[PDB]
Design a protein around this ligand. Structure first.
Ligand SMILES: O=c1ccn([C@H]2C[C@H](O)[C@@H](COP(=O)(O)O)O2)c(=O)[nH]1
Ligand SMILES: O=c1ccn([C@H]2C[C@H](O)[C@@H](COP(=O)(O)O)O2)c(=O)[nH]1
Ligand SMILES: O=c1ccn([C@H]2C[C@H](O)[C@@H](COP(=O)(O)O)O2)c(=O)[nH]1
Lengths: 113, 113, 113
């Protein structure tokens, strides 16, 4: 398993950490949402949560990444939820498919469970 | 009307507050976006705004929730904008359909109106 | 070129800054994602990044805006990635199509490039 600390940022001003698909995968529109493996696992730094978002270059090529909320204490594998919009899309191993944004986790008094 | 304070968090490390649909509703792809009632109303805690996002279990079952921005001072009913992706989806009363994330509302000098 | 400082907020409690399309554009579902020009350019205020999100009134009328991450140091034109969901959609010049949300850019030790 690899932790979020092994992810890289493309440039210092980049909001997101790059997420790559560990497999070659073909997607068609009729398949609906598919969860792509990344080999990267939670959890997140204290007081943060994560959002998985698309890369614009990839969205413009017809692969939609559904925004995904990564809880602070999730310890499973971070997967990318994606769908081919209109056309057949092929994702090659190591292609950068999405990005992870880290955001502050605000405290509230809402009851738990 | 019920306020956001009555929402619950599944676990202490959960980023989102659960939102449930108050009605049983059937959605098909050709229907396009539908606004699901929740019986929960703004406004939000000072200096925050809200984002409505999907639950990954629900997105993987073919119901897409369009990310929705909840303004700090909105006092209407928070509705979930959703679409069946490819298949017929049935939402039962009380099913958890989406989640509300609270985020800091940054001040800027942009002119207002 | 116009900077983000020229954008306006609809009301003081509005989370987003309004983004308008500078052209008249017709979109159909089979076209897939389209990048709409706005004439607004990065970069963003220090320690922030941007998210492009839809307006709910517009999403409910069948135009989906794909959430887009605006990096802090991007100096190009901010474009709106959008898709007609099911029907033909016509966007007129000056119509408010999306909104820009500003969020804190959290520092991490992740390696760069
Ligand atoms: O795109 C996503 C969305 C969620 N999850 C994992 C992390 C979340 O903590 C967990 C539960 O999802 P939600 O209930 O937060 O949506 O699933 C992902 O791997 N990818
Ligand atoms: O998914 C959504 C998106 C918005 N709204 C309500 C709250 C917002 O303050 C208001 C106006 O929407 P926007 O203009 O912020 O998108 O509509 C919802 O109930 N659900
Ligand atoms: O909806 C979007 C998404 C991105 N970009 C520009 C700003 C980003 O800094 C840049 C690279 O996109 P990403 O790699 O962050 O997705 O493209 C846009 O104009 N509109």
């Amino acid at each position: 398993k690899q932790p979020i600390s092994k992810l890289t940022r493309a440039t210092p001003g980049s909001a997101g950490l790059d997420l790559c698909s560990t497999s070659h995968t073909v997607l068609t529109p009729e398949m609906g949402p598919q969860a792509l493996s990344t080999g990267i696992y939670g959890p997140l730094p204290p007081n943060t949560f994560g959002l998985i978002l698309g890369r614009s270059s990839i969205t413009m090529k017809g692969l939609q990444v559904y925004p995904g909320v990564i809880d602070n204490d999730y310890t499973g594998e971070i997967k990318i939820m994606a769908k081919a919009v209109n056309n057949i899309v092929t994702v090659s191993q190591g292609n950068r498919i999405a990005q992870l944004i880290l955001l502050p986790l605000i405290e509230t008094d809402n009851k738990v469970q």
